[PDB]
Design an enzyme around this catalytic site. Structure first.
Site, PDB file in Angstrom:
ATOM      1  N   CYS A 132      -1.714  21.455 -29.445  1.00  0.00           N
ATOM      2  CA  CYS A 132      -2.107  20.961 -30.697  1.00  0.00           C
ATOM      3  C   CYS A 132      -3.501  21.407 -31.318  1.00  0.00           C
ATOM      4  O   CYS A 132      -4.335  20.591 -30.650  1.00  0.00           O
ATOM      5  CB  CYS A 132      -1.426  19.291 -31.043  1.00  0.00           C
ATOM      6  SG  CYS A 132      -2.034  18.815 -32.684  1.00  0.00           S
ATOM      7  N   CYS A 186      -4.959  18.475 -33.427  1.00  0.00           N
ATOM      8  CA  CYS A 186      -5.455  17.591 -32.484  1.00  0.00           C
ATOM      9  C   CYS A 186      -6.861  17.876 -31.632  1.00  0.00           C
ATOM     10  O   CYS A 186      -7.727  17.000 -31.708  1.00  0.00           O
ATOM     11  CB  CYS A 186      -4.235  17.330 -31.631  1.00  0.00           C
ATOM     12  SG  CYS A 186      -3.106  16.826 -32.305  1.00  0.00           S
ATOM     13  N   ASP A 187      -6.823  18.933 -31.098  1.00  0.00           N
ATOM     14  CA  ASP A 187      -7.933  19.155 -30.017  1.00  0.00           C
ATOM     15  C   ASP A 187      -9.082  19.977 -30.509  1.00  0.00           C
ATOM     16  O   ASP A 187     -10.212  20.311 -29.858  1.00  0.00           O
ATOM     17  CB  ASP A 187      -7.261  19.529 -28.682  1.00  0.00           C
ATOM     18  CG  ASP A 187      -6.447  18.280 -28.106  1.00  0.00           C
ATOM     19  OD1 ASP A 187      -6.769  17.401 -28.509  1.00  0.00           O
ATOM     20  OD2 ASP A 187      -5.449  18.699 -27.697  1.00  0.00           O
TER      21      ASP A 187
END
Ligand SMILES: Cc1cc2nc3c(=O)[nH]c(=O)nc-3n(C[C@H](O)[C@H](O)[C@H](O)COP(=O)(O)OP(=O)(O)OC[C@H]3O[C@@H](n4cnc5c(N)ncnc54)[C@H](O)[C@@H]3O)c2cc1C
Ligand SMILES: Cc1cc2nc3c(=O)[nH]c(=O)nc-3n(C[C@H](O)[C@H](O)[C@H](O)COP(=O)(O)OP(=O)(O)OC[C@H]3O[C@@H](n4cnc5c(N)ncnc54)[C@H](O)[C@@H]3O)c2cc1C
Ligand SMILES: NC(=O)c1ccc[n+]([C@@H]2O[C@H](COP(=O)([O-])OP(=O)(O)OC[C@H]3O[C@@H](n4cnc5c(N)ncnc54)[C@H](OP(=O)(O)O)[C@@H]3O)[C@@H](O)[C@H]2O)c1
Ligand SMILES: NC(=O)c1ccc[n+]([C@@H]2O[C@H](COP(=O)([O-])OP(=O)(O)OC[C@H]3O[C@@H](n4cnc5c(N)ncnc54)[C@H](OP(=O)(O)O)[C@@H]3O)[C@@H](O)[C@H]2O)c1
Lengths: 303, 303
Positions: free
Chosen positions: A130, A133-134
């Site tokens: 993701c 996300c990261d």
């Protein structure tokens, strides 16, 4: 007791709940996490008619916002099973049971894994599925993206905000992504390609990823190259474990429906990405969801 | 020569063109009027996921806005016919011909007529099929709406901004509209009902409507009542005259497709309200349109 219960509050489920509630069906919308589903893991959405561009999480909130006002009952629940009892159905979560006349399953799809060494070990420490996300954890790194589809290529393009460079590794010499996204990746100076290649091993030290070993699928040439992050986008598996037993899935586990979103089991409908289909988008999720909602209404009226 | 031509720029056609253009198909979007289709004749849209409420014409503009930037060729055209020539198709408008590999027909549906006396005569002078179009011409009037569906009931509710009163005449004793809209009409003090009734005659003086004669469908009781406006919402006919001959329609004239938006004729797809279907909404139009676009891409690649 519920007229309809909708499992999953991604765009398919949120559309369905909006419609059932407008039909004044007693509506339960169960979600294990945050409303929005995959949209929350999406940085920029360009192809939702009605918005020129919009951040995934913003579209999620906009889709969730009217649901309470319409009388949809929003509740936390991770669904573990469903029992068909003829004229009612029961839904089992971790702690609760719910009885309903009909069910709309809208639980989507999940990242497929490479199943290669280092993939689990570097779990928290260089392997991601993701990018929104990261991504910021890889500022200034050399990032590797695996896959050739819409998600690999879009999320590569997103990741160029963070990385020194982003390399997309695809197992053939032509991407599967939409051409407009291909063309953008070709022109983007921070994107490199490793064509005709698959990853074989992810390697690192005790603490983090340092390199990937990969193979060329036409020659068998093996190469090892330094990278600080690896984002994996090799396709999707259904999220339908709670119906394995019910005879409504194909071999791969996708829920089979007709064009009215009906399964085998009357009063059990499925919509969106969890369905056996080829074309996974927000537009068709929303369409599926509307269709299921209207079919559920018909079904419950006729009960 | 075109990869795809899309006929009609309502939400189904605008979604389809956005998708074909993102696939870098050479895309022609033909529309006879204003982009937006029925949405432009819609005052408030509440059930388009992603907007809590939005005026029809505003949603039309938002859907039209990216199309130029994506390289869709937007052009005026009223289509009069289509010829299947095997490996290409030709589209005929009033003045132009266009050659294309594939076609997506997205031309929607049109108001059905009562076919009663006075209906044509009061044409410009009391009879309307579009409340957002004509509503303000009936300030302070007693308005009559004919029909029991979503459009009759919503557009009645809209018209209460203008009329002293609005009366909905329905030919049974239960509406077909969505319950949330029924409940709103029941509670609205400016809305009256004439149940179990059909209009028989529209009457007036040389210049305008003054009264309607109607009949009760259970008793045959005939009544004549004064009204200043009549808005007619008794359902829809397909807008598909340009394909009458091609063997792709049902008896009523709706375009038949499978669940991939394919007609009989390969390379001719249909989407949205023009299709033979039961559920006509913006959500399913958008869904149809995405699906057609992806199917057209497949078709043209395989040509
Ligand atoms: C990186 C990325 C970018 C994308 N970009 C686009 C784009 O730009 N445009 C586009 O049209 N599409 C895009 N897509 C595809 C799109 O996001 C999906 O098609 C869509 O979200 C599918 O919605 P759905 O409601 O079927 O499933 P999902 O959005 O997957 O929602 C499923 C929901 O069900 C819940 N759930 C699952 N299991 C359970 C359980 N057991 N109990 C309770 N709840 C459960 C999950 O938490 C989740 O919230 C993208 C996908 C990805 C991964
Ligand atoms: C009063 C009203 C309120 C509504 N409210 C809602 C709502 O709130 N929510 C909802 O989901 N749905 C609503 N609908 C239904 C919705 O508007 C339609 O489902 C939707 O617009 C269908 O889109 P489509 O693109 O298939 O057709 P359309 O919007 O009908 O577009 C067809 C287009 O094709 C063009 N065209 C036709 N013939 C030709 C030709 N020969 N050549 C070139 N161009 C041509 C027309 O000009 C038109 O622009 C409403 C409908 C009405 C009438
Ligand atoms: N903007 C959007 O509309 C959007 C955005 C994202 C996703 N989606 C949709 O969401 C769905 C999922 O998309 P996706 O991109 O996640 O999956 P996808 O379409 O299944 O594509 C996965 C890609 O990874 C490749 N691949 C598989 N294993 C590989 C390996 N071991 N090494 C290198 N490459 C590998 C596949 O190769 P082959 O091509 O050889 O199979 C394919 O190119 C699709 O329907 C997609 O269109 C839409
Ligand atoms: N918000 C929305 O989503 C929305 C808004 C508007 C329209 N739409 C959709 O657009 C499509 C068309 O809607 P619609 O409302 O125009 O048409 P519709 O659903 O066909 O309903 C027409 C209504 O008029 C009635 N009727 C027919 N002839 C009559 C007569 N002579 N006298 C009195 N009543 C008569 C019908 O009766 P019976 O009921 O007896 O058949 C029906 O109630 C539908 O699928 C609709 O759901 C959606």
């Amino acid at each position: 007791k519920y007229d309809v219960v909708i499992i999953g509050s991604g765009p398919a489920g949120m559309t369905a709940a909006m419609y059932t509630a407008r039909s004044e069906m007693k509506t339960l919308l169960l979600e294990r996490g945050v409303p929005g589903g995959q949209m929350n893991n999406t940085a920029e959405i360009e192809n939702y008619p009605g918005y020129e561009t919009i951040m995934g999480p913003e579209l999620s909130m906009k889709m969730a916002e009217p649901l309470e006002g319409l009388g949809v009952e929003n509740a936390y629940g991770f669904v573990t099973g469903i029992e068909d009892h003829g004229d009612y159905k029961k839904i089992i979560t971790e702690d609760d049971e719910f009885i309903t006349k009909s069910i709309i399953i809208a639980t989507g799809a999940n990242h497929r894994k490479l199943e290669i060494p280092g993939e689990e070990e570097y779990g928290a420490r260089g392997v991601s599925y993701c990018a929104v996300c990261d991504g910021a954890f890889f500022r200034n790194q050399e990032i590797l993206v695996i896959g050739g589809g819409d998600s690999a290529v879009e999320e590569a393009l997103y990741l160029t905000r963070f990385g020194q460079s982003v390399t997309i590794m695809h197992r053939r010499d032509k991407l599967r992504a939409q051409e407009i996204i291909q063309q953008r990746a070709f022109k983007e100076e921070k994107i490199n390609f490793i064509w005709d290649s698959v990853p074989m091993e992810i390697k690192g030290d005790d603490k983090k990823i340092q390199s990937v070993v990969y193979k060329n699928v036409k020659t068998g040439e093996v190469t090892e190259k330094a990278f600080g992050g690896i984002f994996i986008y090799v396709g999707l598996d259904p999220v339908a474990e709670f119906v394995s037993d019910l005879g409504i899935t194909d071999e791969a586990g996708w829920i089979i429906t007709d064009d009215h979103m009906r399964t085998n089991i009357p009063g059990i409908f499925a919509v969106g990405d969890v369905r056996q289909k080829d074309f996974r988008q927000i537009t068709t999720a929303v369409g599926d969801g509307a269709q299921a909602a209207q079919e559920a209404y018909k079904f419950v009226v006729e009960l």
